[model samples]
Target chain A: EIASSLIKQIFSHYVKTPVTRDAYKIVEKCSERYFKQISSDLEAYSQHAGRKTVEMADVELLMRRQGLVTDKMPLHVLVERHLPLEYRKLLIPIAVS
Target chain B: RRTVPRGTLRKIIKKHKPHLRLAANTDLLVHLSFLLFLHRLAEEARTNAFENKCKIIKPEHTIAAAKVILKKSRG
Candidate 1:
């Protein structure tokens, strides 16, 4: 709902008319569905390696299993995108062992 | 169990690169590897379809599975 306000604000800056309820609702659903998967996804990867503390290698395994590409932005980048900068430093790459 | 035909592999290798030939047991190994890949690909697609709560696996699901495996081959 808060994001919807910001989303509406952003849209209002470009358009003269007010953001419609349906427009706000569309963004609400989009943001909700988009981000709702992150927590569970991270948890699944965490649990997969026997902990939320997963090796980079296992993250790729999970990504592959989840039908995501693994060539680039394997995990750390994804984790970085979702995590705050402070937490991003802890991201480590695991060897292909 | 799904199995790849060695004769098909034979035709492929012959047509693709007529200059090269495979070792005796290599054909068998290639056949097995191809079969296993297909099996895993099908399994992965089916799992994806099921996870998405779809009654059937679609081309997009199979394409997604293939992308995952293709990345594994390099990245």
Candidate 2:
């Protein structure tokens, strides 16, 4: 749970913008090999607050719940256009969130 | 210093290349988690070193520091 919470906070800070449903779908598809057991959990948990969509918030929360928050900032920044490198680097090292 | 043989490094690379590739292909979430864990460890080391006026961290020191952090974080 701590790991999950930590992951969520890191992702939230790193993935600023919302993630598209299609993107979520792609991640789900890709995760089949590595995260086979949790793929469905990820999909179900990623749905947006209102719509059956997946946004940045869901991704963040999911990361936190799963405790996958530490090493992914660089990759997330590279992929998420809205996230700035400086902020990501600074926040990446801290666990305040 | 002695030099490594011309093809020795290459041989090592060939042997461990899959691990390197795996690291390269690792997902962001897993990478971040590990980094965060390490960062926390490092920060605690710095704090303890500062408080105790120590310059180096030993393996036992690292274990103790990590335990402190885990305890605090869990609480």
Candidate 3:
């Protein structure tokens, strides 16, 4: 479901030189499967709680279990680093009246 | 940096599990997480190519990287 233009742009950004068509195909296909696996896992967690709705906590829980989050680099840290200021503003809670 | 279109991702969710609902901006977190994974894979593959003394990243390099990346995805 991803766009080829986006994929090619990403590949070129990381890869310094031209790559084989098979190399491109490999990443593209692998990304799709990765998405599939992530989606299924999220579904499992949501269903396990007897809720049909997916929550942000589910994402964090999955990543934490996956070791994606570490003491040195936690969820909000990466979000602040890569996500735009607008997103961080919305995501980070602020003390209010 | 660019991101996957939220509409397209919504389609994928509905197609696979139409009954499931996502909380506010949950897709944004999902999108960010996916991009992070892609970045890690690309960086690992490039490092693998460099360690191999190869000038360019090849399919073999990407495959080897995936072996490492996917392991974490499963855990």
By lDDT, the best candidate is 3
Q: lDDT of model 3 at residue B48?
A: 85
Model 3 docking tier (incorrect/acceptable/medium/high): medium
- Using DockQ as the measure, which candidate wins? 3
Better of 2 and 3 by TM-score: 3
In candidate 3, what are the lDDT values of residues A1-97, reduced to their tens digit?
Answer: 7776677677767665666677777788777777777788888989999898889888887777677777777888877777777777776767221
Q: Across residues B1-75, which tens digit of lDDT does each residue of candidate 3 receive?
A: 665577877766776677878888788777777767777778888888889898877899888887788666762
Q: Rank the candidates by lDDT, best first.
A: 3, 1, 2
Clashes of 3: 0
By TM-score, the better pick of 1 and 2 is: 1
Q: Candidate 1 lDDT, tens digit per residue, A1-97?
A: 1234543443333233333465445433433332233223434554655653423444355454544525664544444444344334333334321
Candidate 3, position A45, lDDT? 88
Judged by whole-model lDDT over C-alpha atoms, candidate 3 comes out at: 0.76
Q: Whose TM-score is greatest here?
A: 3
Q: What TM-score, computed on C-alpha atoms, does each candidate reach?
A: 0.39, 0.32, 0.86
Off by over 4 Å in 3: A14-18, A93-97
Roughly what TM-score does model 2 have, to 2 decimal places? 0.32
Determine the C-alpha RMSD for candidate 3 after optimal superposition of all C-alphas: 2.7
Order of quality (DockQ):
3, 2, 1
What's the lDDT for all of these models? 0.42, 0.37, 0.76
